[PDB]
């Protein structure tokens, strides 16, 4: 118990919030170029003291490849901030 849900489709509001956070992280880590079209393929969630969102993301023509990236969203009543994890390269299959 306490593991991830099965992957699911990403909501419009989730794309709006998390896609630029994940792009910014991949860009600052030197993993993608600034022109990268990044797609959130799916998300799996784990409820802790807050929520872990595990994304599988795909790059477009200038950033081909897939990464797994975990984002932590804490509870409002917490001293902790929203944190993007370290991206890991994964197979798109």
Author numbering: 4 to 96
Manuscript excerpt for this entry:
FhCyLS-2 from F. hepatica is an unusual member of the superfamily, where our sequence and 3D structure analyses in this study revealed that it combines characteristics of both families. The protein architecture demonstrates its relationship to stefins, but FhCyLS-2 also contains the secretion signal peptide and disulfide bridges typical of true cystatins. We determined that FhCyLS-2 is a broad specificity inhibitor of cysteine cathepsins from both the host and F. hepatica, suggesting a dual role in the regulation of exogenous and endogenous proteolysis. Based on phylogenetic analysis that identified several FhCyLS-2 homologues in liver/intestinal foodborne flukes, we propose a new group within the cystatin superfamily called cystatin-like stefins.
The crystal structure of recombinant FhCyLS-2 was determined by single isomorphous replacement and refined using native data to 1.60 Å resolution. FhCyLS-2 crystallized in an orthorhombic space group C2221 with one molecule in the asymmetric unit and a solvent content of 48.3%. The final model of FhCyLS-2 contained 93 residues (Val4–Thr96). The molecule adopted a typical fold of classical stefins like the human homologues stefins A and B. In contrast to stefins A and B, the intact C-terminal strand β4 was split into two smaller β-strands in FhCyLS-2. Importantly, FhCyLS-2 incorporated two disulfide bridges into the disulfide-free scaffold of stefins. They were located in loops at the edge of the β-sheet and indicated as D1 (Cys39-Cys66) and D2 (Cys69-Cys95). While the positions of the C-terminal disulfides (D2 and D4) were similar, the upstream disulfides formed an interloop bridge (D1) in FhCyLS-2 but an intraloop bridge (D3) in the cystatins D and F.
